[PDB]
């Protein structure tokens, strides 16, 4: 393995940026703070080895993620502020989500409160909502692709499985990698759309109210012989409000679904409290949301 540059070099645009601390790791990309040694503004750099995009197909991919993900720009998608390569590597300039992402919140939270889980998938369904409307099928939405900034607000990140819908009632056949919270459509392979982000955040949704997720057994394989049968149960003191939408989103026929469209307007988000923000103690210890100190 070759060792990354202390400096990353943009030869086109000229820009400079330090390397700083590791934020981690996911398939072929290290993750790492860097600062633009000019203006000293921090962004998460994603650093790829060309040593792992030897054939076409893996390079075809990456380029597809990084074509798709350029073209996006809304507060809810994580930035995309450039990319440049050398001889060995292909360097990602996103915007820095200092908070990690909804993944590392569960692992800590568990259950969320009714009005964080609210706040959270609202800002989710508000982002997956740019993507639909920019024919933009993301493909694994998941806890861990859902990064939160310094002010907790939600980036959806990884178009690594995101796909472009071509013409009116294309039905992709083809999901090149292993989605964790995949649809019935795509394991009995009849095609699919649009619909499978709409699952997604049905199964993030079950999993911010219960605690943890709809269909998960020891083996992914039993997993998948769930989601088949529509084999989940909502514990009982989930409300009945979140429950219906979570039984709406979660059925195995994908035109039955609500669209991305229709979720905002649901019950569960117009009659319920949503928090304007959420203080950083909501990383570790459930808010009350009290009306005035003690
Ligand atoms: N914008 C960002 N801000 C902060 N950390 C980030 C950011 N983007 C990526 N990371 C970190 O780097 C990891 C890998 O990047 P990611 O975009 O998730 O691609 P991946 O390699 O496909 N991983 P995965 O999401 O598990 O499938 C993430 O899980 C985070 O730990
Ligand atoms: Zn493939």
């Given at each position: 393995?070759?060792?990354?540059?202390?400096?990353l070099?943009d030869?086109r645009?000229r820009r400079?940026?330090?390397?700083?601390?590791?934020?981690?790791?996911?398939?072929?990309?290290?993750?790492?703070?860097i600062?633009?040694?000019?203006?000293?503004?921090?962004?998460?750099?994603?650093?790829?080895?060309?040593?792992?995009?030897?054939k076409?197909?893996?390079?075809?991919?990456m380029?597809?993620?990084?074509?798709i993900?350029?073209?996006?720009?809304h507060q809810?998608?994580?930035?995309?502020?450039?990319?440049?390569e050398?001889?060995?590597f292909?360097?990602?300039?996103?915007?820095?989500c200092?908070?990690r992402?909804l993944?590392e919140?569960?692992?800590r939270?568990?259950?969320?409160?009714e009005?964080?889980?609210?706040?959270?998938?609202?800002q989710?369904?508000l982002?997956?909502?740019?993507?639909?409307?920019?024919r933009?099928?993301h493909?694994?939405?998941?806890?861990?692709?859902?990064?939160?900034?310094?002010?907790?607000?939600?980036?959806?990140?990884?178009?690594?499985?995101?796909?472009?819908?071509?013409?009116?009632?294309?039905?992709?056949?083809?999901?090149?990698?292993?989605?964790n919270?995949?649809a019935?459509?795509?394991?009995?392979?009849?095609?699919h759309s649009?619909?499978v982000?709409?699952?997604?955040?049905?199964?993030?949704?079950?999993?911010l109210?219960?605690?943890?997720?709809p269909?998960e057994?020891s083996?992914?394989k039993?997993?998948?012989?769930?989601?088949?049968?529509n084999?989940?149960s909502?514990p009982?003191?989930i409300?009945?409000?979140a429950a219906?939408?979570?039984?709406?989103?979660?059925?195995?026929?994908?035109?039955?679904?609500?669209?991305?469209?229709?979720?905002?307007?649901?019950?569960?988000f117009t009659?319920?409290?949503?928090?304007?923000?959420?203080?950083?103690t909501?990383?570790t210890?459930?808010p009350?949301?009290?009306?005035?100190?003690?």
């Amino acid at each position: 393995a070759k060792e990354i540059p202390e400096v990353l070099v943009d030869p086109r645009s000229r820009r400079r940026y330090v390397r700083g601390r590791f934020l981690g790791k996911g398939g072929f990309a290290k993750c790492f703070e860097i600062s633009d040694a000019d203006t000293k503004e921090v962004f998460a750099g994603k650093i790829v080895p060309k040593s792992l995009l030897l054939k076409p197909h893996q390079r075809e991919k990456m380029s597809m993620e990084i074509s798709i993900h350029r073209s996006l720009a809304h507060q809810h998608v994580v930035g995309f502020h450039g990319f440049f390569e050398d001889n060995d590597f292909v360097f990602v300039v996103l915007e820095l989500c200092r908070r990690r992402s909804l993944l590392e919140l569960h692992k800590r939270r568990k259950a969320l409160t009714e009005p964080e889980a609210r706040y959270y998938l609202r800002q989710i369904v508000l982002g997956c909502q740019y993507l639909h409307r920019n024919r933009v099928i993301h493909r694994d939405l998941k806890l861990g692709n859902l990064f939160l900034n310094e002010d907790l607000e939600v980036k959806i990140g990884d178009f690594g499985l995101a796909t472009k819908v071509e013409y009116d009632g294309e039905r992709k056949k083809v999901l090149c990698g292993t989605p964790n919270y995949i649809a019935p459509e795509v394991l009995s392979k009849k095609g699919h759309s649009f619909e499978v982000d709409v699952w997604s955040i049905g199964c993030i949704m079950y999993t911010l109210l219960v605690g943890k997720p709809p269909f998960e057994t020891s083996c992914l394989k039993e997993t998948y012989l769930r989601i088949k049968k529509n084999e989940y149960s909502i514990p009982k003191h989930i409300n009945p409000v979140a429950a219906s939408l979570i039984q709406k989103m979660l059925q195995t026929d994908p035109t039955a679904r609500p669209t991305i469209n229709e979720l905002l307007n649901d019950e569960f988000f117009t009659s319920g409290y949503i928090p304007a923000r959420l203080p950083i103690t909501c990383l570790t210890i459930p808010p009350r949301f009290s009306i005035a100190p003690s």
